[PDB]
Amino acid sequence: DRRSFSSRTPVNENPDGVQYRRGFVTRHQVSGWRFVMRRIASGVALHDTRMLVDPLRTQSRAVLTGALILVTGLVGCFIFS
């Protein structure tokens, strides 16, 4: 196709790679933390951690769409006046 390049980090064998000292959080780390905290909260409530269907995310996204419908109704009734 186009012969892309996967993410790679070889071993260093050199005294620079031990010197990073920075903590910066990626998109993959925050998505992995979202997945772990949605597997634990579906592991102390649903008591099954297969994560096929997660109902807590369904409820929380339902109340978030409620708040979003509130905000869109506010921006719709503000432009009326």
Binding site: R2, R3, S4, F5, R8
Partner: protein, 31 residues
């Protein structure tokens, strides 16, 4: 006259690992 020297084994040199390091070629600009 002149003192004797004995043919010891030399000290070991710091080794030169003569490996053939390979670099993966870059990607190919899709368009």
């Amino acid at each position: 006259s002149r003192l004797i020297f004995e043919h010891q084994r030399r000290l070991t040199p710091p080794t030169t690992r003569k490996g053939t390091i390979t670099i993966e070629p870059p990607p190919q600009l899709p368009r």
